Structure 1
Amino acid sequence: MNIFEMLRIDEGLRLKIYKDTEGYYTIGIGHLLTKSPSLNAAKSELDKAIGRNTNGVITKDEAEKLFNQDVDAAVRGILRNAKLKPVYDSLDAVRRAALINMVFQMGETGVAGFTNSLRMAQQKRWDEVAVNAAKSRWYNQTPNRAKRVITTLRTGTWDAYK
């Protein structure tokens, strides 16, 4: 298993504009288009992202291209983030994947917000990280997904995904 397969499982794949769990316009594999309540604004963002007049529909290949970009950016975001880099540097490969997942979902700022979890992660206090990360809006809103990520972070294995 890997970060792509992991996120593909968590976000799913949709070829038409849709609303995410928060009600935002999204497409493909969890690619947020906009936080604005307008489908048109969404259609505009889409066309600009893809480079053509889509009419709110893309192909698989197109979705996958956005996905590649998104993963790359999350990784790059982490490494440029002062609060995030060090955590990531200290982790093993599977747990890094968990951190990338969180960043892909909530953005750098959101993750940087788990200050206490991050510190504990750096100290390798696995059970404490899991307890602390669950006390969050993140966990209350999308619990099944959050559970999968937390387990991953806690155990350092892909069990939750198999």
Structure 2
Amino acid sequence: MNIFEMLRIDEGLRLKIYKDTEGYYTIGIGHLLTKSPSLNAAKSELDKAIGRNTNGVITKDEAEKLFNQDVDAAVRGILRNAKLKPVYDSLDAVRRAALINMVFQMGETGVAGFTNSLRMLQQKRWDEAAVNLAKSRWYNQTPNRAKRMITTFRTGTWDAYK
């Protein structure tokens, strides 16, 4: 297992524009297009992203290419973030993938806000951090995905994803 396969499981694959769990226009593998309520706006952002007149549909290949860019961006975003980097550096490979997933889901900013949990993770206090992470809107809105992540941080293995 790896970050790519992990997120592909959490996000699914859709080749036509869709609404995410928050009602935002998305496509491919969790690639957010816009927070705007307008579909044209979404269609526009999409064409701009792919580089062609797509009419709201893409191929698998195009989806994958957005995915690769997005994973890459998250990683780099972590490394540049002064709150995030030290955490990521302290972790093992499995747990690093969990952190990337969360950043991919909620953005750097969102994650950098889990101050307390971050600290606990850096400290390697696994169960405590798992309890703290669950006290969040994130957990209450997407509980099954959150439980997968939490197990992952707790255990350092991929069991939640097998």
- TM-score for both structures, normalised by structure 1: 1.00
Deviation for aligned residue 1:11: 0.1
Cα RMSD for the two superposed structures? 0.2
Q: Figure out how many residues of one structure are paired with residues of the other and give that number.
A: 162
Deviation for aligned residue 1:2: 0.1
Q: Which residue matches 2:87? A: 87
- Classify the secondary structure of the residue corresponding to 2:9: helix
Deviations for 1:48-81, whole angstroms, at most 9, x for unmatched residues? 0000000000000000000000000000000000
Distance 2:111 2:62 in 1: 28
Q: Which residue matches 1:158? A: 158
Deviation for aligned residue 1:160: 0.1
Distance 1:14 1:66 in 2: 12
Deviation for aligned residue 1:89: 0.1
Deviation for aligned residue 1:82: 0.2
Deviation for aligned residue 1:114: 0.4
Deviations for 1:90-121, whole angstroms, at most 9, x for unmatched residues? 00000000000000000000000100000000
Deviation for aligned residue 1:31: 0.1
Deviation for aligned residue 1:18: 0.1
Q: Which residue matches 1:119? A: 119
What runs of 5+ residues in structure 1 fail to find an aligned partner? none
Runs of 4+ in 1 over 6 A off after TM superposition: none
What fraction of aligned residue pairs are identical, expressed as a percent? 97
What runs of 5+ residues in structure 2 fail to find an aligned partner? none
- TM-score for both structures, normalised by structure 2: 1.00
